[PDB]
Every structure is written in C-alpha cells, then in structure tokens.
Amino acid sequence: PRRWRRAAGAAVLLVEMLERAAFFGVTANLVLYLNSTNFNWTGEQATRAALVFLGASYLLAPVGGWLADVYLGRYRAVALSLLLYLAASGLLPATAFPDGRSSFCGEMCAPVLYAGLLLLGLAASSVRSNLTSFGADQVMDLGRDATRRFFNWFYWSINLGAVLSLLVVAFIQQNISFLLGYSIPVGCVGLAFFIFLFATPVFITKPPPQEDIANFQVLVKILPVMVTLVPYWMVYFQMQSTYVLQGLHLHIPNIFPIPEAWLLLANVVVVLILVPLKDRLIDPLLLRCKLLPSALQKMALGMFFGFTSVIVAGVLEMERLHYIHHNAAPLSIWWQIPQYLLIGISEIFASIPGLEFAYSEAPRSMQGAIMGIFFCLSGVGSLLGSSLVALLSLPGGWLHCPKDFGNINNCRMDLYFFLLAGIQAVTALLFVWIAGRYER
Amino acid sequence: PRRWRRAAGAAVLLVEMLERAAFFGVTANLVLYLNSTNFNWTGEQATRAALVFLGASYLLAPVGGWLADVYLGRYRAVALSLLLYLAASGLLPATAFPDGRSSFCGEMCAPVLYAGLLLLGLAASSVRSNLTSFGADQVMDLGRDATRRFFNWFYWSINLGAVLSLLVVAFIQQNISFLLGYSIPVGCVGLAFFIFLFATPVFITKPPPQEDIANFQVLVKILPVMVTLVPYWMVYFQMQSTYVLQGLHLHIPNIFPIPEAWLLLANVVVVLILVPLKDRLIDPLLLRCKLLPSALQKMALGMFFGFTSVIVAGVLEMERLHYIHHNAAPLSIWWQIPQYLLIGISEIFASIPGLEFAYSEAPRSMQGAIMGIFFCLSGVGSLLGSSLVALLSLPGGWLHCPKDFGNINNCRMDLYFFLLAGIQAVTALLFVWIAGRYER
Numbered sequence: 001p002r003r004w005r006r007a008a009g010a011a012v013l014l015v016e017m018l019e020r021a022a023f024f025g026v027t028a029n030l031v032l033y034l035n036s037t038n039f040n041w042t043g044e045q046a047t048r049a050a051l052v053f054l055g056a057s058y059l060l061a062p063v064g065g066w067l068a069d070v071y072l073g074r075y076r077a078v079a080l081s082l083l084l085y086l087a088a089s090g091l092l093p094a095t096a097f098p099d100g101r102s103s104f105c106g107e108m109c110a111p112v113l114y115a116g117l118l119l120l121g122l123a124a125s126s127v128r129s130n131l132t133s134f135g136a137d138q139v140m141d142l143g144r145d146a147t148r149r150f151f152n153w154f155y156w157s158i159n160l161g162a163v164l165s166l167l168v169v170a171f172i173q174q175n176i177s178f179l180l181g182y183s184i185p186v187g188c189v190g191l192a193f194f195i196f197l198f199a200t201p202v203f204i205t206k207p208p209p210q211e212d213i214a215n216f217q218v219l220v221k222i223l224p225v226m227v228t229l230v231p232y233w234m235v236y237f238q239m240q241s242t243y244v245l246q247g248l249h250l251h252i253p254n255i256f257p258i259p260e261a262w263l264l265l266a267n268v269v270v271v272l273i274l275v276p277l278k279d280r281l282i283d284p285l286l287l288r289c290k291l292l293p294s295a296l297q298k299m300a301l302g303m304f305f306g307f308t309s310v311i312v313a314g315v316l317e318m319e320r321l322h323y324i325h326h327n328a329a330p331l332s333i334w335w336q337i338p339q340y341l342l343i344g345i346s347e348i349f350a351s352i353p354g355l356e357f358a359y360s361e362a363p364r365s366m367q368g369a370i371m372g373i374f375f376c377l378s379g380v381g382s383l384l385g386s387s388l389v390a391l392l393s394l395p396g397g398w399l400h401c402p403k404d405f406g407n408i409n410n411c412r413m414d415l416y417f418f419l420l421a422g423i424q425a426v427t428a429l430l431f432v433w434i435a436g437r438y439e440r
Numbered sequence: 441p442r443r444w445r446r447a448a449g450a451a452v453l454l455v456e457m458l459e460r461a462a463f464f465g466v467t468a469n470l471v472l473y474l475n476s477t478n479f480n481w482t483g484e485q486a487t488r489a490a491l492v493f494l495g496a497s498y499l500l501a502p503v504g505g506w507l508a509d510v511y512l513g514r515y516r517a518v519a520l521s522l523l524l525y526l527a528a529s530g531l532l533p534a535t536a537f538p539d540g541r542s543s544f545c546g547e548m549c550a551p552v553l554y555a556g557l558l559l560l561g562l563a564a565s566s567v568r569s570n571l572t573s574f575g576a577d578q579v580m581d582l583g584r585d586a587t588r589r590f591f592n593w594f595y596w597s598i599n600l601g602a603v604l605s606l607l608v609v610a611f612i613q614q615n616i617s618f619l620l621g622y623s624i625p626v627g628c629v630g631l632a633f634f635i636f637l638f639a640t641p642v643f644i645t646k647p648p649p650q651e652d653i654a655n656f657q658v659l660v661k662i663l664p665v666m667v668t669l670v671p672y673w674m675v676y677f678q679m680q681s682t683y684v685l686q687g688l689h690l691h692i693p694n695i696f697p698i699p700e701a702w703l704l705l706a707n708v709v710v711v712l713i714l715v716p717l718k719d720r721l722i723d724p725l726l727l728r729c730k731l732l733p734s735a736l737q738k739m740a741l742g743m744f745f746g747f748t749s750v751i752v753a754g755v756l757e758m759e760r761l762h763y764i765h766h767n768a769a770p771l772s773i774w775w776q777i778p779q780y781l782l783i784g785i786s787e788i789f790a791s792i793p794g795l796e797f798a799y800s801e802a803p804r805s806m807q808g809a810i811m812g813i814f815f816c817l818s819g820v821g822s823l824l825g826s827s828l829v830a831l832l833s834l835p836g837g838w839l840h841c842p843k844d845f846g847n848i849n850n851c852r853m854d855l856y857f858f859l860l861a862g863i864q865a866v867t868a869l870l871f872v873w874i875a876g877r878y879e880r
Contacts, residue, residue: 436875
C-alpha cells in the first residue's frame with residue numbers, strides 16, 4: 001500500500017473474480033465435452049458435477065499451495081499457476097477441434113482429460129490461495145481495520161465473481177455459439193493477467209531444522225480448531241442445496257414477471273448485500289460498544305447464527321407439515337428470505353473472521369499453506385457432505401425427497417433438520433470447548 | 441469419619457429421606473385442608489400445587505440458609521429448623537381438631553396458614569441445606585473419591601426418600617383414616633430426630649471487613665455459572681412434566697397387571713437405578729482411562745446428554761406425528777425408557793457434579809448459603825418454568841395439549857421441543873463460554 005492501495009485492491013478483486021469466472025466456464029466446458037463425445041462412463045452427469053469438482057479442487061488445494069509457497073515463492077506461485085491455466089486453455093482447442101479428440105483418444109481422450117482436470121484444479125487452488133495471501137499481506141501492511149474491511153470486500157468480490165461467472169458463461173455458451181464460449185475464458189484470463197502485470201509495481205514482493213519442528217507444535221493446536229470446522233462445513237454444504245430443495249417444494253410466486261439453479265445464486269446474492277451493510281454499519285458499532293469479538297467470538301457467533309439458521313429452517317419445516325395436517329401451498333415462501341439472510345449472516349461471520357483467524361496463527365513460513373488447507377475443510381465438508389446426501393438418496397430416503405417433489409416417500413425432512421441441528425450444536429459445543437483450549 | 445463414618449452417612453441419608461417424607465406429607469395435608477374448609481379462593485387447586493410449593497421453598501432457601509449459617513452456626517441451624525418443624529406439626533392438630541379452625545378463622549385460618557407455610561418452607565430448606573453441608577464436610581474430611589461416592593449416594597437417598605414419601609403418605613392418608621395420617625409425619629420426624637441425636641458423637645461440629653468483601657469477588661465469578669443454570673433448570677422442569685404429557689398421549693401397555701402421577705415417580709426410579717450403576721462402574725473407569733472430568737466437564741457433559749435427551753425427545757416427537765400421517769397407537773411407548781434413562785444420565789451428571797462443584801468455590805464462611813442459592817436455581821426454573829407452562833396453557837396453546845388428550849388443538853408439540861432444544865443448546869453454549877471464563 002505505497003500510494004495506490006485502492007487500485008491494488010481493486011485489481012486483486014478483478015483478477016480473482018475473472019479467475020473464478022474462467023474456472024467455472026472451463027469446468028462446464030470439459031464436463032459437457034466428457035458427457036458428449038464418448039468417455040465410456042459418460043460421467044453419468046449433467047449438473048451438480050461442478051460442485052463436486054470444486055470440492056475436489058479444494059481437496060487438492062493444500063499440497064499444491066504448500067509446494068507453491070515452499071519451492072516457488074509467492075509471486076512465481078501465481079505466475080506458474082496461471083501458466084498452467086494457459087496450458088489448460090491451450091488444451092481447450094483440442095476440446096474444440098475434432099482432430100484434437102481424434103489424436104487424444106486415437107491412441108493411449110480420458111487420460112489427457114484426467115491430467116487436464118488435475119492441473120486445472122491445482123492451478124485454480126494455487127492462484128486463489130496466493131491472491132488471498134497477497135491481499136492479506138498488503139492489508140496487514142496497511143492496517144488491521146483495513147484488513148477486516150478488505151477481507152469482507154474480498155469475500156463479496158468472490159461472490160460477485162461467481163454470480164457474473166454463472167450468468168456470463170450460461171449466456172455465451174448457450175445463446176450464440178461455441179467458439180465465442182471458448183474465447184471468452186481465454187480472453188478474460190489474458191486481460192486479468194495483463195491487469196496483474198500492470199499492478200506489479202504497486203504490489204510488494206516477498207522472498208520465499210528446529211524452526212520447522214516448532215511449526216508442528218503450532219499445527220497440533222490449530223488443527224483441532226480446523227478439524228472441527230469440517231462438521232460445520234459438512235452441515236452447511238447440504239444446507240446450500242437443501243434450502244434449494246426446501247424452496248423447490250413450495251409454490252413460487254409470480255411478481256414482476258435455469259430456475260432450479262438460480263436458487264444457488266440466491267444464496268450468493270444474499271452475501272452480495274449483507275457484506276456492504278456489515279462493512280459500513282456493524283464494523284463501527286462493534287468498536288464503540290466494546291463487544292470485543294477478537295476474531296474467535298465472531299466465528300463462534302457465526303455458527304451460533306448457523307445453528308439458529310437451522311432453528312428457523314426447522315421451525316419453517318414443521319410449519320409446512322402442520323398446514324398439510326389442516327387439509328399444496330406456498331407455505332410462507334416469503335418467510336424463507338430471513339433464514340436465507342440468517343445463513344448469510346452465519347456465512348459472513350464464519351468465512352471473513354475465519355480467514356482473518358487463519359492469519360493469526362500464520363507465522364510467515366507457510367502462510368499460503370494454511371490457506372489451502374483451510375479451503376480444504378470446505379471441500380471435505382462438500383464431498384463428504386454430498387456423499388452423505390448421495391448415501392441418503394438412493395438407499396437412504398432421508399435425501400430422496402426430490403423424487404415426486406416430496407409427495408409420497410420416506411423423506412423425513414423433519415428428522416434431518418432436527419438431527420442436523422444436533423450435529424451443528426455438537427459442532428458448536430466442540431468448537432467452544434476447543435476454542436477454550438486455544439487461548440490456553 | 442472417626443470410626444463410624446458408615447453409620448454416620450447412613451443416619452444422614454435416613455434423616456434426610458424422613459424429612460422429605462414428612463415435608464411431602466404435611467404439604468399435602470395443608471393443601472387438602474385449604475382446599476376443603478373455606479379458604480375463600482380455595483387455592484383453585486387439587487394437584488400440582490406440591491411442585492410449585494417445593495419451588496417456593498427453594499425460593500425461600502437462600503435467605504434462610506444464609507441466616508442459619510451466619511447467625512446460628514451449623515448444628516444449631518438444623519436444630520432450630522427441626523424445632524420450627526415441630527412447631528408446624530404442633531399447629532397440625534389445629535388442622536385436625538375443628539376447634540383449631542374455629543379459633544383460627546373465628547378471629548383475625550388464612551393468615552395462620554400463610555405463616556405456617558412460610559415457616560415450613562424455611563425449616564425444610566434449612567434442614568436440607570444443612571444436612572447436605574454436614575455430609576459434605578464429613579466426606580471432605582474423609583476423602584475426595586469418598587466425597588463423590590457419598591454425593592451420588594445422597595442424591596440416590598433423596599430420590600428413594602421421595603418415592604417412599606409418595607407411596608406411604610398416599611397409602612396412609614387415603615386408605616385407613618386421618619389421625620394415623622397425622623401421626624405418621626410427627627412420628628417419623630421424632631424418630632429421625634432421635635437418630636440424629638444418637639449420631640451426634642460421630643458427627644464433627646464446626647464453629648460458626650476486607651475478608652467479607654473478598655467473598656464478593658468470588659460471587660461475581662461463580663454467579664454467571666449459576667445464573668446460566670436457571671435456563672437449564674427452566675428447560676428440565678417442564679421436561680419432568682412434558683415427558684409425563686408425552687407418555688400420557690400414548691397407548692399404555694398391559695403387562696404383569698394414581699396413574700397420571702406415577703410417571704412423576706417413573707423419572708425418580710430411573711435415578712434410583714442409574715446411580716448404583718454409575719457408582720460401581722463409571723467411577724472406576726473414569727479414573728483409569730484418564731478422561732479428566734474435573735467437576736466441570738461432568739456438568740457440561742450432563743447438559744450435553746440433556747440436549748441429547750431433547751434430541752431423542754424431538755426425534756420421538758416427529759416419529760409420533762409421522763405415524764398419524766400414514767393413517768391412535770402406542771407410538772413406540774417402549775422407546776421412551778431410553779430417553780427417560782438418558783434424562784437420568786443428564787440429571788446424575790448435573791446434580792452430583794454440580795453439588796461437588798459448589799463446594800469447590802465453597803470458602804468456609806458461607807458454605808451453607810451457596811447450597812441454598814443453588815437449590816434456588818431449581819426453584820426459579822420450577823416456578824418460572826411452570827409459569828411458562830401456565831402462560832402457554834390458557835392463552836398460549838403450546839402447553840394446552842393436555843386438553844382433549846392432544847387430538848384437535850394448537851398443541852405445537854414439535855415446535856416446543858424444537859425451541860426447547862435451541863434454548864438448551866444456547867444454555868449449553870453459554871455455559872461452556874462462561875466455564876471458559878471460569879478457569880481464567
């Protein structure tokens with residue numbers, strides 16, 4: 001933050017959102033290609049594959065980020081991850097041209113796509129973690145209140161980038177043609193890399209035994225704070241889809257003139273408005289009234305609202321079944337935006353304070369590695385959370401409610417939200433118990 | 441514990457159980473008399489008055505115990521409380537003889553009964569707290585493991601005394617006559633006082649500024665641990681009646697050949713068997729496996745089982761409504777004994793560790809006062825808990841389920857158990873948060 005800290009932060013947000021946009025675009029491209037040509041298993045997939053692939057990218061994040069920050073530095077890390085992304089986008093014309101496929105699966109299509117997906121996940125995770133670390137370092141050199149403000153703005157920028165990604169890739173790759181849908185990601189990546197190269201003067205670079213063993217004692221005390229985050233991430237990830245499932249069972253209203261995937265963006269637009277309100281209102285009042293949320297009570301209050309979000313979800317659940325007992329209806333569909341706003345309060349109070357929390361036990365030897373493993377907690381809660389959904393879907397019944405739009409089945413939506421509240425309360429009870437041993 | 445610590449402990453248990461028996465007997469006697477003669481309001485009461493009167497006794501416990509331990513000592517405290525009990529039992533012939541009533545409410549029946557009830561509550565609370573303090577002092581002079589064993593045995597003896605009280609007072613005062621029902625409490629009190637006077641040699645007596653101000657700093661740090669116990673006591677006391685209400689809505693089975701009040705004893709007999717199993721099995725394994733439950737994690741684990749007891753209660757709740765949706769039945773009435781055993785595990789892990797917890801921040805100037813205010817937390821959770829039940833009964837509906845045996849009403853039993861789980865989880869979250877500041 002020499003003189004253009006505003007321009008540096010803005011460029012960071014732009015390059016991050018464009019990276020996320022290109023990521024979603026190329027993932028949808030490769031998934032569609034795999035489903036189309038032969039790919040003998042065909043993936044057996046049309047949608048929801050993107051979420052599990054982002055979870056797999058989060059799973060691959062820790063080792064890639066660790067390698068990047070231990071054997072490549074911090075600037076060359078993003079540089080080479082973006083270069084591997086250029087390699088993936090230069091493999092993309094093989095997806096475009098039929099000669100590419102004829103040369104891929106004309107000899108020893110499947111393995112080259114496996115390698116491309118692996119490299120793409122590694123590069124995306126590395127560039128995400130390293131841009132987060134860049135912004136964090138810049139704002140820690142700037143100020144602590146500025147650090148919190150920039151973390152909130154960075155999460156808001158991630159959300160806006162995901163929204164614009166969804167909309168623009170859907171529009172381009174479904175409306176006009178395919179070659180434009182192939183040149184949009186490569187062009188956005190090129191212009192984001194140009195912006196990043198134009199921002200290298202205002203960016204501050206940093207250089208890459210018994211001191212390494214001392215880091216293990218720091219790991220054995222912060223990991224219990226992070227291994228207990230997996231149950232919290234396991235609970236929230238199905239709520240990102242069950243809230244869509246709960247909203248799908250309601251009568252949608254017609255006011256002011258893909259629907260099943262728009263509710264996925266509905267959880268994101270809630271974060272798009274909660275952060276600007278929390279940044280300008282909650283931040284000043286939290287300093288004057290002296291609530292003392294020293295980056296840990298904020299995370300505990302978020303999951304408290306997260307458990308309360310399940311309370312409003314469970315209360316709304318029984319309110320839907322009691323109307324059926326009266327003898328289908330919207331079932332207070334407008335009463336779902338508060339719990340959608342409440343889960344956004346839980347998300348803004350667990351991600352942004354959690355991101356700032358990870359930089360408290362940072363010590364600057366593996367600062368990028370602790371960020372990759374932090375995103376891994378979400379991916380583990382995503383894959384195992386989706387596996388818990390998939391396990392309760394085919395032979396389970398507890399997640400088989402989507403069939404027959406939840407009319408006659410062993411749905412047990414009341415038992416799931418009630419058991420999820422118990423798991424969330426246990427996760428909240430275990431966290432405060434571990435947080436009590438954290439300060440010790 | 442000079443040589444007859446076994447006999448001393450046994451005499452303590454006997455005098456405590458006989459005191460509780462006489463207490464229940466005389467309370468039922470006075471309630472029946474008030475309801476019978478005129479007592480213009482008539483109490484508007486037939487049953488459930490005993491619970492609220494025990495809650496009022498708990499409310500009066502703190503000031504009485506404080507006066508007893510600050511201006512009377514410890515032995516003279518029990519002595520004069522039992523003497524006031526003799527005064528109440530000598531007022532009881534006025535309840536018996538009609539001339540007593542003609543002289544009471546022939547001039548300035550109501551005020552003498554108010555004074556008698558006040559003195560009876562004060563004496564009962566004082567003798568209970570002082571017998572608890574006597575046993576605690578004896579076993580702390582004996583040993584710590586012996587202290588925990590005797591606390592468990594003392595709670596078990598309280599439960600057995602309540603059971604024998606119920607059964608014997610019901611049998612005598614309903615089967616044969618009334619004069620025997622009047623001589624049973626006075627005779628039991630006399631023989632218990634004789635046993636106590638026979639045990640004074642083995643009992644060890646104890647004698648009754650800036651040091652008093654220093655006790656306030658101890659109060660401002662242990663009260664938040666105890667004010668947060670009121671929500672836990674507020675949650676459990678309706679569960680002592682809602683479990684009876686939930687069991688009343690089921691089809692009772694016929695096996696091996698007052699029913700609505702027997703389930704109140706069903707929660708007590710569960711404690712009558714859980715303590716002997718916990719004393720001989722849980723105590724040895726807790727020492728060898730090194731779980732380190734240093735009198736606070738035990739209390740936190742109890743409410744964790746208490747919240748889990750609501751989980752099994754809530755899961756059983758939706759299991760009862762789902763059968764009605766299938767289209768009344770026992771609704772797995774035998775699946776209620778685990779949650780009855782689970783709430784007994786929560787009770788044995790919150791009372792006995794809580795009693796031992798109160799003696800950790802004891803310091804021996806007001807050791808009897810901290811026990812009276814501890815029982816006051818249950819009474820406050822009892823009266824306000826019953827008030828919450830009464831508030832949700834007439835205009836509420838959430839507790840109006842007993843009417844029409846929960847067939848057609850605004851029962852909302854699913855919303856109550858779900859909201860009670862949230863309040864219990866908040867109480868559990870607030871406790872661990874306060875317990876974290878306790879060791880600090």
